[PDB]
Design a protein around this ligand. Structure first.
Ligand code: NA
Ligand code: NA
Length: 327
DNA sequence: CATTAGA
DNA sequence: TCTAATG
């Protein structure tokens, strides 16, 4: 957690670079299992050889660990950190819609900068267009203050469209959080579940409602169950307009709402931990259901959930407010 | 780990 | 269809 800090830090810098800059899946997959285990290690790594005794650590990484142990730096790391090209890839990538794949391509074409991007908006598809368009706003965190405003809006229209709809703002926002990266709305309706063959309109209707009143201002992607777009708070009695914020709404079969809601609320850790608990308690939990575990090894049979409570009860735990779903 | 776009 | 990109 800190005893192995720079080493795992370096290890991860390395990993990242294989993946994005080069296309070295393996190498990259390498650096990471390494960084995974040396991080688990209970003692201060004093040398290569020592590290070396670990699973995943090879001659390769070892060598690296020595140089870094020996001197506060690594050359390769020093070179990459300099390198224009690899620098560029790191940057473009920050643009929603721009992955490494495209990052690479643009670069080799000569688009390195943000400006570069503009002069060639034409080489970009929609997503990247918006991504570029709202680059600055997309990077800004979302105040809880704002979040409450946003939330207030969505729940409102959603209702007006159908009073039978159930929506939930999941994420850190849900768990207290003073800020947030983007709004996630979990949605379901009673006429939509595991069997009942869809009703795409169900998503569509609300997306529409939202655009109608000007909340959603762009669409990154609209499918029949997942909409990914852009929103914005009505810039009041002017002098101050709001940022463009990413937003995603997802339709869920009423019959899996809670797991889904559980899950999305996180935290990444509470999950696992909650996840690990249900196992002993003779169960299984994933994004959608909860299945009693059978002896033969595994087993199935989706248990009936009407609230986040049902889940807890099931596994006989303490209903934990979201606020405290921190770990 | 799954869904949407794209070409 | 495969492949990319967010989540
Ligand atoms: Na080893
Ligand atoms: Na990006």
């Amino acid at each position: 957690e800190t005893l192995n800090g720079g080493i795992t830090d370096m290890l991860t810098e390395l990993a990242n670079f294989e993946k994005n800059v080069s296309q070295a899946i393996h190498k990259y997959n390498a650096y990471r299992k390494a960084a995974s285990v040396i991080a688990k290690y209970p003692h201060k790594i004093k040398s290569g050889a020592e590290a070396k005794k670990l699973p995943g650590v090879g001659t390769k990484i070892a060598e690296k660990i020595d140089e870094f142990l020996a001197t506060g730096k690594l050359r390769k790391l020093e070179k990459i950190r300099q390198d224009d090209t690899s620098s560029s890839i790191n940057f473009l990538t920050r643009v929603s819609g721009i992955g490494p794949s495209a990052a690479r391509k643009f670069v080799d074409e000569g688009i390195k900068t943000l400006e570069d991007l503009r002069k060639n908006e034409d080489k970009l598809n929609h997503h990247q267009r918006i991504g570029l368009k709202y680059f600055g706003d997309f990077e800004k965190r979302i105040p809880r203050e704002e979040m409450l405003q946003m939330q207030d809006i969505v729940l409102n229209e959603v209702k007006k469209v159908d009073s039978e709809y159930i929506a939930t703002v999941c994420g850190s926002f849900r768990r207290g959080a003073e800020s947030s990266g983007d709004m996630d709305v979990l949605l379901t309706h009673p006429s939509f579940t595991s069997e009942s063959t869809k009703q795409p309109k169900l998503l569509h209707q609300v997306v529409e409602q939202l655009q109608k009143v000007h909340f959603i201002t762009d669409t990154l992607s609209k499918g029949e169950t997942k909409f990914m777009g852009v929103c914005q708070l009505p810039s009041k009695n002017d002098e101050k307009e709001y940022p463009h914020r990413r937003i995603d709404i997802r339709l869920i079969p009423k019959d899996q709402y809670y797991c889904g809601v559980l899950y999305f609320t996180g935290s990444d850790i509470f999950n696992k931990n909650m996840r690990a608990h249900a196992l002993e308690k003779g169960f299984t939990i994933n994004e959608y259901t909860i299945r009693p575990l059978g002896v033969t090894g595994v087993a199935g049979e989706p248990l009936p959930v009407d609230s986040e409570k049902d889940i807890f009860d099931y596994i006989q735990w303490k209903y934990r407010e979201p606020k405290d779903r921190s770990e």
